[PDB]
Each structure stands twice: as structure tokens, then as C-alpha cells.
């Protein structure tokens, strides 16, 4: 449920444009270890996670991504690192056994990262859960475990060389879209707001590709102390620059599309420069030549994406 004041402003904020995707960097768990040993704070941080999910669910925020584990967090204390694994196993064990209850409300969970760094059982639980919870269309939560944006894009990068090495795509078909469609978050759309708690003001290798035009919201509160008003202030800030960021996104699009068209029409002429043909257009030699080029890249890339899913779906089995 929500408070009267909380349900009031929600209806008021729901007037204007609303964020369809909001991502959270939950920081400052360690700083709240005042009179707490340190894994007691992390436990409290997971509670405010579920609390904040109630809120976004109340607010009609459809999709939410969270930074649960960075690969950089591997260099932490073995006691503290093993302490995160215990909790990772704990809450995930609650995801199972509490099945079907999760089927009632249309919620799906996706673990995003390079999963080969975790202990086998964690891989199993994570894969167990995501396979079960998939094909649920009302609500979506992306949890980032063992994730860095740097690792992410390098993985999306090597997976498209896979395609050229597999004869499914050719390097001409490589684009911002192709690269866009091969990150772990390809099921999600790009986040509308990024929120990071504590006085820190850096991105920490979190979704650098997908939040290049998202609204950045940094707040001095420690995350365990997160309130609904902390969340409300972010949507407030988001709605202010919505017109700018919309227009900003709307012009990058047109430019990249126009620039892609200028380049595409160029190489069609380069081949027409050879072979002695003329770029006349008299009987649409270049017009059909470019027309076919779009499809051959469209069909060849489209198949690569279907192949990449089948590849990724096979790992879900085990």
C-alpha cells in the first residue's frame, strides 16, 4: 500500500510524463555500519530494496535495475565477500520455495553479469530462478550480480565477432543498434533515471552505455535510510529535464540515422566507383543497390539476434 500523502503526490506526479525504467546504485551500506557486524547493514540494505520496490510498483514504474555486485567488489574482505554470498544465496532461496506466489503478480527477475565468477550453487539458483520467472509480462526487475559496464560491452563486442566468425553477420552490419541489442540488458529499454545514494558522485562502471542520456540523480542520503521522498525527489528532477532529454535523445537519433544513411549511400558509390558504373540514378542502379543493402544487413543481422537468443537460452538449461 501507500500513504495518503504518498498516494497524493503519486497521483499528482502521474499527471506529467513518468519514468518507465529507473536504475539504482545502492551505495553507503558500509557507511551505515555505525552501531551495527558490517553484514547487518547489508541485510538492512536489502530490506529497503524491497521497500523501494513497493514504491516503484505503487508508482507504476514498470522496470527497475539494481547494482547488486560489481566485479570490483571481489577484492573486498573474504569475510565480507563471503558475507554477500550468504545473503545472495539466502534471498535467492526465498525466490524459490516462494514460487507461484511470484507467479500471481506478473513479475520477472533477470540476473545480469558475467556469471562464471560465482560459486556453482549461486549459478544454479540464479539460473534456476531466471528460467522459472521468465515469460512474465507485468513487471520486470534486473539484478546486476558480478557486473561492470566495461565487462558488459566487451562481452557484447566479442559476441558479435562470434557472429562474423559464424557467417551470420558481416562486420558491415555492425552498428550502434547491433551493439545495443547484444548487452545483458537487451530485454530492457534504456533507463529513464539513474539514482546513486551517498555523497559520492561517480558512475562506477554501471550501465555507461544505456544511461548516456538518462537523468542523473545523486543524493546525499545513505541507501539503508532511503525513503519514499528520496525516490519522489528523483522523479521530480527527472520530470524537469524530460523535455530536454527527450529532445536530446530525439536529435541524436535523427543525426545517427542520417549519418548512417550518408555512409550507406557512400559505400554503394565506392563499389559503383569500381566496376565502371555511374552514380547516375538513371534506372535506379544505386537506388536498388542501396535498397538491397539494407535488407541483406537487416535479414543477416536479424538472424544473428535469433541465433544469439538460442545460444543464451541453451545456457539457461544447465
Amino acid at each position: 500500500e501507500l500513504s495518503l500523502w504518498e498516494r497524493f503526490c503519486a497521483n499528482i506526479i502521474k499527471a506529467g510524463p513518468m519514468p518507465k525504467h529507473i536504475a539504482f546504485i545502492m551505495d553507503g551500506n558500509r557507511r551505515y555500519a555505525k552501531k551495527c557486524e558490517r553484514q547487518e547493514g547489508h541485510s538492512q540494505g536489502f530490506n529497503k530494496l524491497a521497500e523501494t520496490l513497493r514504491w516503484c510498483l505503487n508508482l507504476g514504474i514498470l522496470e527497475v535495475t539494481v547494482y547488486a555486485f560489481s566485479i570490483e567488489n571481489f577484492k573486498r574482505s573474504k569475510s565480507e565477500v563471503d558475507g554477500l554470498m550468504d545473503l545472495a544465496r539466502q534471498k535467492f532461496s526465498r525466490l524459490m520455495e516462494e514460487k507461484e506466489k511470484l507467479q500471481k503478480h506478473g513479475v520477472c527477475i533477470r540476473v545480469l553479469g558475467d556469471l562464471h565468477l560465482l560459486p556453482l550453487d549461486l549459478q544454479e539458483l540464479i539460473a534456476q530462478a531466471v528460467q522459472a520467472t521468465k515469460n512474465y509480462n507485468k513487471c520486470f526487475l534486473n539484478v546486476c550480480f558480478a557486473y561492470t559496464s566495461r565487462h558488459e560491452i566487451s562481452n557484447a563486442v566479442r559476441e558479435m565477432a562470434w557472429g562474423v566468425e559464424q557467417g551470420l553477420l558481416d562486420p558491415s552490419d555492425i552498428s550502434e543498434s547491433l551493439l545495443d541489442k547484444c548487452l545483458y540488458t537487451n530485454r530492457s529499454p534504456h533507463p529513464d533515471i539513474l539514482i546513486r545514494t551517498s555523497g559520492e558522485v561517480r558512475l562506477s562502471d554501471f550501465l555507461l552505455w544505456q544511461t548516456s542520456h538518462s537523468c542523473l540523480v545523486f543524493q546525499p542520503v545513505l541507501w539503508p535510510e532511503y525513503t519514499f521522498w528520496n525516490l519522489f525527489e528523483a522523479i521530480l528532477q527527472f520530470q524537469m529535464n524530460h523535455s530536454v532529454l527527450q529532445k536530446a535523445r530525439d536529435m541524436y537519433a535523427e543525426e545517427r540515422k542520417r549519418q548512417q544513411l550518408e555512409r550507406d549511400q557512400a559505400t554503394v558509390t565506392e563499389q559503383l566507383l569500381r566496376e565502371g558504373l555511374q552514380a547516375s540514378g538513371d534506372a535506379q542502379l544505386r537506388r536498388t543497390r542501396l535498397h538491397k543493402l539494407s535488407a541483406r544487413r537487416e535479414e543477416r543481422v536479424q538472424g544473428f539476434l535469433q541465433a544469439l537468443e538460442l545460444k543464451r537460452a541453451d545456457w539457461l538449461a544447465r
Binding site: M160, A161, R202, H213, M251, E255
Partner: protein, 196 residues
């Protein structure tokens, strides 16, 4: 004989607990066409206090489409205040890079096109790791920004070097029009204490 001015600025640089090796200036102010005079003074001040590489970024490209007008004013103010032009003009171009959206994302796909064509030439195999990506981008030589400065109301990076900003500090300021050295210096004084 304005050598005391170099003494003053270098003294301010060695005084901070930490100065950025690399810094970026992002100008979100799209209310009016920006004034190169304020931009040129900002980069001039960074060089004076001892910041090696500065990058200037505008999501519409008005800096990249006006490199000559901006480089002109950066040199003039340097001659005007800091006061052998070949070497001076060389160190400026070596230090200041003017950036636009096609340098972060569109460049990321450029290197991806490099590996993939090398894969098609049988020279390259995917089995492409983390440091191989970094050396493959146009930042092969140059490091990553320690600190970016956001000027204007918009609260995004607007596509500014997403790969390189991985651990950088962001400081936003209300505007770059009529900016003063005292304003710009307390930004560095903010970054000096900023957990790095």
C-alpha cells in the same frame, strides 16, 4: 613580464590535494549559442594550474564544427594573459581535444568494426578482453578523465565518452557564461577532497 601570473596559477595547482591529470568540460547550456570566450578561459586556466589534457564537449557539435574559432581564442588568451608560438601552439593542440557525441558511442562501434573485420581476415579471434578494448579505442594513448565539469541545466552526460567515464567525478555548475576563476577553482577544490 606577466610571469607572476604563471607563478600564481602554478601555486594554486600545487596547493590542491589532487589535481586531475585529465579533465572534461561538458556544456549542456543550449539556451543560446555558447560563448567561446568563457570556454577558452576555462581551458586556459586548467593548463595554467597544471592539468594536462582537457576535452570540450557539446552534444550538438558546435565546438567540433568550430575548432578553428575556439582554438583561435584559446591561443589568444594564452598570449593575452600567460604571454616561440610554434611550440606554444603545438602544446595547445596536443593538450586540448574538442569532442562531440560521435566520439564515445559511435567510436565504440568503430573499434568493434575493427575486431570483426580482423576476425573476417582470420587474423583475430573473439576469445577481446577488457584491456584489449581500451587500447582499441581512440583513447589508445590518452587516459580517462579524472573529473568532468557539467555546465548548464541538463542533468545528463548527453553521450559524453561513456566508456571512459567509468570512475570519474562529476561536478555540475549552473552555467559557463561569465564564469570566474574563483568559481572554477573551488570545483577543483571540491574534486581534491573527492575520495580518490
Amino acid at each position: 613580464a606577466a610571469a607572476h601570473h604563471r607563478m600564481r596559477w602554478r601555486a594554486d595547482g600545487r596547493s590542491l590535494e589532487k589535481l586531475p591529470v585529465h579533465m572534461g568540460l561538458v556544456i549542456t547550456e543550449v539556451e543560446q549559442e555558447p560563448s567561446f570566450s568563457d570556454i577558452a578561459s576555462l581551458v586556459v586556466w586548467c593548463m595554467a594550474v597544471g592539468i594536462s589534457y582537457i576535452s570540450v564537449y557539446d552534444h550538438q557539435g558546435i565546438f567540433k564544427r568550430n575548432n578553428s574559432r575556439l582554438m583561435d581564442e584559446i591561443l589568444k588568451q594564452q598570449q593575452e594573459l600567460l604571454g616561440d608560438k610554434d611550440d606554444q601552439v603545438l602544446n595547445c593542440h596536443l593538450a586540448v581535444k574538442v569532442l562531440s557525441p560521435e566520439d564515445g558511442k559511435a567510436d565504440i562501434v568503430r573499434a568493434a568494426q575493427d575486431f570483426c573485420q580482423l576476425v573476417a581476415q582470420k587474423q583475430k579471434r573473439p576469445t577481446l578482453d577488457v584491456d584489449t578494448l581500451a587500447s582499441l579505442l581512440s583513447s589508445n594513448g590518452c587516459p580517462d578523465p579524472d573529473l568532468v565539469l557539467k555546465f548548464g541545466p541538463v542533468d545528463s552526460t548527453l553521450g559524453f565518452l561513456p566508456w571512459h567515464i567509468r570512475l570519474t567525478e562529476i561536478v555540475s555548475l549552473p552555467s559557463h557564461l561569465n564564469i570566474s576563476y574563483e568559481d572554477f577553482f573551488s570545483a577543483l577544490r571540491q574534486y581534491a577532497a573527492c575520495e580518490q
